[PDB]
């Protein structure tokens, strides 16, 4: 009767940037969606694959969750098939997906009145994002004849711009929190059922 | 159809307190997010308040933050903005603005005749 | 911090020209919306994602652009188009300056 943690990670404090996304694999559940389905505040709540009503009695095997901070803005890029800045370098979904996409408002918790630059993300790769893979390779793009020996400047730029949030600026760029449940069916006997 | 017409609004003496209303008529109120939208006499939109559809996420602008609080009635199918602590930046029309989805994050559609605050004398 | 500036404040069109108004974004936004007010009354809308069109307006507005600039375009301005022709985006807490459309 092990409720399975969802509560390390929906309600947790320090979410990690989107460039590093943290990826925990629930399993072992007994899982009840009851308890994030009683909120108002949700921004998006699209699901694919399932209709978001009646979660409880569809058995899956493995069920992943992925977390970061996003823009208000680029919630929309976070969707089966749309491509721009955080689903071609960042985070990128298949486009035979079968989960939710949940997001917050929350400008109260993650941003403060000066420049909090806790959060990155990607600005280039060589090229795109094969579907759930994620790079920490914070190494200078070369791009000359010239090794520049990693200290960035003229013909080399660094990987990594970072967010600034400050929540003078606008219901699109204070920061939205987006947690990404994905469900899967593996060949393996049922694991994660309320 | 789908009309606003609003009411409250005068003129104050700098320091005041208002409260002006939004009356909705023709759509379900409880599934629409709305704000206030207000224009300056130099003719030039801004955001000032907006809420979500539910009634518990609030959005104000860095300007104008802890002295508008915007509201929104169920009952009797109304709506509530009001005023304090008002500067001479203040002065201008206010237009009640019904979006399209259940955030602030759908395209302005319905307007109403706004409403007339001056601060003066 | 999003600034949206609209170039230029004032355009001329006769009733058979073709116009642009250009709305351009400091930052990279996704979609961008456009409003129009005749002076009395209050704006409606008239253009929803860049690139559809409001119930009840004619077929000479279109808009079309992604990234950092927007742009609507009239093919044949007519005598009704007379107005401020607004642009915003969600995410800016603030509109356009505002274009005015006076007819030549």
């Known amino acids: 009767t092990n409720l399975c943690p969802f509560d390390e990670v929906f309600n947790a404090t320090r979410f990690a940037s989107v460039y590093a996304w943290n990826r925990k694999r629930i399993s072992n559940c007994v899982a009840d969606y009851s308890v994030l389905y009683n909120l108002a505040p949700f921004f998006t709540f699209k699901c694919y694959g399932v209709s978001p009503t009646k979660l409880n009695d569809l058995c899956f095997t493995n069920v992943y969750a992925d977390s970061f901070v996003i823009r208000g803005d680029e919630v929309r890029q976070i969707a089966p098939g749309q491509t721009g800045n955080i689903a071609d370098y960042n985070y990128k979904l298949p486009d035979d997906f079968t989960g939710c996409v949940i997001a917050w408002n929350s400008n109260k918790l993650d941003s403060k009145v000066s420049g909090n630059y806790n959060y990155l993300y990607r600005l280039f790769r060589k090229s795109n994002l094969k579907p759930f893979e994620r790079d920490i390779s914070t190494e200078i793009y070369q791009a000359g004849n010239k090794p520049c020996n990693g200290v960035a400047g003229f013909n080399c730029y660094f990987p990594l711009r970072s967010y600034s949030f400050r929540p003078t600026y606008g219901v699109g760029h204070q920061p939205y929190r987006v947690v990404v449940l994905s469900f899967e069916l593996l060949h393996a006997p049922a694991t994660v059922c309320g | 159809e789908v009309m606003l017409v609003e009411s409250g609004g005068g003129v104050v003496k700098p320091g005041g307190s208002l409260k002006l209303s939004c009356a909705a008529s023709?759509?379900?109120?409880?599934?629409?997010?709305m704000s206030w939208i207000r224009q300056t006499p130099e003719k030039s939109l801004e955001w000032v308040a907006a809420?979500?559809?539910?009634?518990?996420?609030?959005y104000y602008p860095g300007s104008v933050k802890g002295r508008f609080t915007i509201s929104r009635d169920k009952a009797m199918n109304t709506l509530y903005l009001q005023l304090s602590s008002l500067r001479s930046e203040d002065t201008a029309m206010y237009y009640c603005?019904?979006?399209?989805?259940?955030?602030?994050?759908?395209?302005?559609?319905?307007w109403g005749q706004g409403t007339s605050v001056t601060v003066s004398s | 911090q999003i600034v949206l500036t609209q170039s230029p404040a004032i355009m001329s069109a006769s009733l058979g020209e073709e116009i642009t108004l250009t709305c351009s974004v400091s930052?990279?936004?996704?979609?961008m919306h456009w409003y129009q007010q005749k002076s009395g009354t209050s704006p409606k809308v008239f253009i929803y994602?860049?690139?559809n069109l409001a119930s009840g307006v004619p077929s000479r507005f279109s808009g079309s652009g992604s990234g950092t600039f927007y742009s609507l375009t009239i093919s044949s301005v007519e005598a009704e188009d007379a107005a401020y022709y607004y642009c915003?985006?969600?995410?800016?807490?603030?509109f356009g300056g505002g274009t005015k459309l006076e007819i030549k």
């Open positions: 603005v019904r979006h399209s989805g259940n955030y602030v994050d759908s395209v302005m559609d319905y």
């Open positions: 023709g759509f379900s109120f409880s599934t629409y997010a």
């Open positions: 809420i979500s559809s539910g009634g518990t996420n609030t």
């Open positions: 930052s990279s936004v996704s979609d």
């Open positions: 994602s860049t690139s």
């Open positions: 915003h985006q969600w995410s800016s807490w603030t």
